[PDB]
Amino acid sequence: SMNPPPPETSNPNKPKRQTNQLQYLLRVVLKTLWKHQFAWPFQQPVDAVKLNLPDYYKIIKTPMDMGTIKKRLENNYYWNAQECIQDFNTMFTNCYIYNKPGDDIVLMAEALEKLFLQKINELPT
């Protein structure tokens, strides 16, 4: 189909390592973005079939979405905050490189990104 398998959400052979920063990323950053009225297009992989988007995965080579990030945090996939932040940034980048500037999805990503950056600025030590 037009859709790939979703990204992996478990990190093979990685020891469990909980940190205040990772707790914050899940319970503050992800949770705040997840509840936002504009989160819904980003809560699961882009479904190019159900959305009739034959060009999406032609253009987006590194898919990412907040459902994947959420599961990665829940599964302790990330070794540190920067790895999780990188996935959020990839999700926003994909939106901005595929969709035409000004489209509703872009304004929604912009709103979520502003909230993201505000929360990341208060990452615990």
């Binding site: 297009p41 009739n52 988007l53 595929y98 969709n99 509703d104 999805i105 304004l107 929604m108």
Partner: peptide, 10 residues
């Protein structure tokens, strides 16, 4: 691109 259309954000 094809685009995703309106998302009813007013």
């Amino acid at each position: 691109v094809i685009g995703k259309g309106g998302k009813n954000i007013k």
